[model samples]
Each structure stands twice: as C-alpha cells, then as structure tokens.
Target: HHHHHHMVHITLDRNTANSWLIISKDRRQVRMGDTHQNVSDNKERFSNYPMVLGAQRFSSGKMYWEVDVTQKEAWDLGVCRDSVQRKGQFSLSPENGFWTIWLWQDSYEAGTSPQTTLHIQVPPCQIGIFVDYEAGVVSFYNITDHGSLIYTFSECVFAGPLRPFFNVGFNYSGGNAAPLKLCPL
Candidate 1:
C-alpha cells in the first residue's frame, strides 16, 4: 500500500475555451494533451503534451487521476502518440461525432497495447471517472446537468492490478476546446 492518498479532479465548464488535461507520473502538472489534427504525426507525443495545469505527488501505490475534453467533431480517445515509449492512455470520441471511449496499456513502445475501445451515441455531456483500488479497475460515467450518471464505462481495464501510483488523464480534439476543472473528492 502507499503512504498517502492524492486525488485531482478537473471540470471543463462551458467557459475557458480551448483546454484539455494531461497527467504524467514523472511530472507535477496537467497539460493540454490533445491530438485532433495530424493523426499521422507521431513526433508530437504524450510527453510533448504540455503539463500546464494541476499536478500532485503520491506514493508508489497511490492513484493519479484527471478529466479533460475534446468537443464534437473531434477525434475520439486512444493512444495518439507518435512514439511508443512516450505514449499514454486516452479516451476517444466516435467517428460520427458521437461519444466514445478508448484505453491503452503501457506506452506505444509496448506495442501500444489497447485494453478496450467503446463508442456511445449519447448527446454531448460530461464524462466522469471513478477508480477503485481494491477492485483494481478504472470506470467512467456519463454525467447529466444535475450530476447524475447517464452512462457508464462500456469496458474496464485491470492494468496488471492497481498500483499505488499511476497517471490518469483526459484529452479533447474537437473545435469545442474548453478548460476542465479539477475537484478532489
């Protein structure tokens, strides 16, 4: 088990246009990590996704989490890095501009192993995340205006058991670029 517990929550309101969240275990900030254009370009990798916002430190067994966005008509989440060593996890939107989810294992160098990819046709809404250490799983929920779960993760990942410390983040690739608010619960 880890020595301490740290949680970072970010909310992308209707304001603060042009924003996303990038988290790294090796850094102490959340960066704008989105790759909407130039899908073929891999040089602009996850490490290059500027660590611009909230960041914190935790022990090896602690969990790191964040939420970001890419609006309608943007690329959905997945491993969007140019290189495998620098690649991280991502959730993508659907091809038809609908909501979708994507999860990758390790870095791109490790074959950029993908855990699960799912697509949903719900209206544009906020995505919420919840991680359980005991269960060793990371889950997602679609949030309504009243703060209710309209949808849940279509798939979950074991990720070789829950570590005391790991990096979780969000990215947006659509024109509706907006800042996300991080609230610790």
Candidate 2:
C-alpha cells in the first residue's frame, strides 16, 4: 500500500477570456481547486476536487488523460455548471457547449448511477482518456489525426473504496478559456 500520485500540466493563455486549470492533492489541502469555471454572474461560486487517476480499492494500472482547450466558441468537455443542484456552481457561456466525464458518489445530488458509471460527451473536439482498472474499462479518445475511439464504457464501476474524483471541463455559454491535463499510469 504505497500510494502517492501526482501529475499536473496546465497551459491556458489564449487571450485569457475565462481561464481555469486547477489541481489538488495537497496544494495546501481544501481540495486544491478549479478544474475549470468561467461563469460571469448570478451569484457565482465554483468548486473543485479534480485530479485522481485510478486506484479505488485494491489498484490496477494504465491511466492516461489529457485536456487542451483553446477556443473562441465551443466548450463543455466534462462537467459544466448552473445547477448540479446548486451549492455554488456556475459557468455556461458560448464555449461550444456539451462535454462531461463523470464519477459521482457523494454529490450532484447522487443522481448518476450505474455502479457510479463514468462517461459523458458532447462536441468534445479533443480529449483522450483511457482507464483500465484491471479491466473495468473507461475509454474515450478523439484528439484528431487518427486518435479515434469516440467513447466506450464496458464495465465502468466506482462508488466507494474512495479514489474517485475526476472532472475535465467546458460548457460554454459565453466566456471561453480552456486548458486541462492529468496524467497517471
């Protein structure tokens, strides 16, 4: 049981309309912050708990993830906000809406289950994620140039043993700025 993981790479500076790419695992605790959120008004509040790649109970192997969004319009890669049931969540601009990669176990009102199923997509121009926790498969890839495998969820399961807090971003209704990355294998 020697588990310690860390891998974060973010680069967002395409005019900085609404930038976000935050990670945590002890950046000072408090769940570090911000995977991505660029909400303008209406009582704004953004939360964060992203950055966990694999190892829910015993452990397995193979995990690769990436996020790079630089857009003028067109967003929503994974998990956007307005009402995950309200508790501080905002962001819905013209960033090319629709993109979600999910794993819910204790929030979003516990409204997503299939053994805590994972996989949500909509206009995800570039995203590559492959998780094989001893063959519980969770794959989604289409980073252009031949990286095709749109989406697939074989036997995705993650509900309890802890390790399940992963979110990639984008859901643009107006303000746009995107760049997110996570890596662990």
Candidate 3:
C-alpha cells in the first residue's frame, strides 16, 4: 500500500496577526502577546480575531501542515480564502468561507456546514491539517497519536487561492502559555 501524503511548509506573517498576538522572531511560532500592540486596523489585518496567516498560498493539489498545540486552552486553526471577510462578526463555517477547527473550553469544534462538536478521548497537543483541493475535502488529524482523524469538511468548493489561518484567542487558564508552533519538516 502506498500513501500519497502531502506536507507543506509555512511561514508566519506578522502583519496578519492580531495586535495582541505575538509572532516569534523566526516567524514560525505564534502565541498570545503580553498585551495588545494597539495597531491601526486594515483590510488584511484581523483585529477582533487574534490570528495570523501563512506567507504561502494554495490553489490546487494536496497540501498538508502541522501545528504544535501544546497545553492550549483555546485556539483556532484552519484555512481561509483570500476573499474571506476580514471585518465584522461572521461564522467560521465553510459557507462563510472558512474550513477549520477550534478548541473552545476543552471541546473540539469543527466548523463544517452546521458546525459539529467532536468528543475525543485523547488531547490534541499536535494537529495536522490535510487538504485535497480538487477532491473538495479538508481533514484534520491529531498528531499526538500518529495522525488520528479529528474531522473533515467535505465538498469544499474552493474557488480561489487559500492560505493557512490561525488564532491564539484567549488563554483562559494560562495553560496556553506556549505558542502555536508550525512544525518544520
């Protein structure tokens, strides 16, 4: 049996990270900053959302990426299109242009069509995201146990280029002291 696994590289974009979020000097790790940076808002910047985007864009083929989510109390990781609404409040569902998953209050939520709550036996210290653009599918996996399926967003009609999106959000219990590190392979 042959598995055609596709893993890609990621470079953190400081410009997109929320003022309250901090990007490491190497731009590979992103975490909650001590306090907000108090920067002006723009179309590309995510103000309400404590998030950052990758420098790489994907339009087709199989692309994969992994994130170290150690001791995170709350975090959101997923991909978003260039046209995704940047301002105002909007649902993180695919219909609203986001295919991602998040951890809210120790509960895993997959932002699919109607949003689904996932009950997993193991904690996800590491996460793997896989995308098959042509196949119209986006899947999430737990890297702690050698890639356990977490969720999948099917029938994704990707119309344009997409980039990896991440958010540190609120670190409720200080358990989120560690930043979201992009695993380099």
Report backbone clashes per prediction.
25, 18, 0
Report per-prediction Cα RMSD to one decimal. Answer: 11.2, 16.3, 2.0
List the global CA lDDT of all models.
Answer: 0.31, 0.34, 0.82
**Arrange candidates by lDDT, highest first: which order?**
3, 2, 1
Runs in model 2 with CA error above 4 Å?
A: 1-42, 48-66, 69-81, 86-99, 102-112, 115-140, 152-185
Clashes of 3: 0
TM-score of 3: 0.91
lDDT digits (tens) for residues 13-80 of candidate 2: 22212224343342211111234445342322223322222222224575454554334233223322
The residue pairs in collision within model 3 are none
Shift in Å, residue 22, candidate 3: 1.0
Residue 170, model 1: Cα distance from true site in angstroms: 13
Worst 10 residues of 1 by lDDT: 75-84
| Cα lDDT of model 1 by residue, 1-185, tens digit | 12115354332211111223433343332334454422333332334332221222112232434334423232222111111223344323222111224322321111113323334445333445444444433344434333333233333333332221112333333333333334335
* Candidate that scores best on TM-score: 3
Q: Ten residues in a row with the worst lDDT in model 2?
A: 103-112
List ranges where model 3 is wrong by over 4 Å.
1-5, 38-40
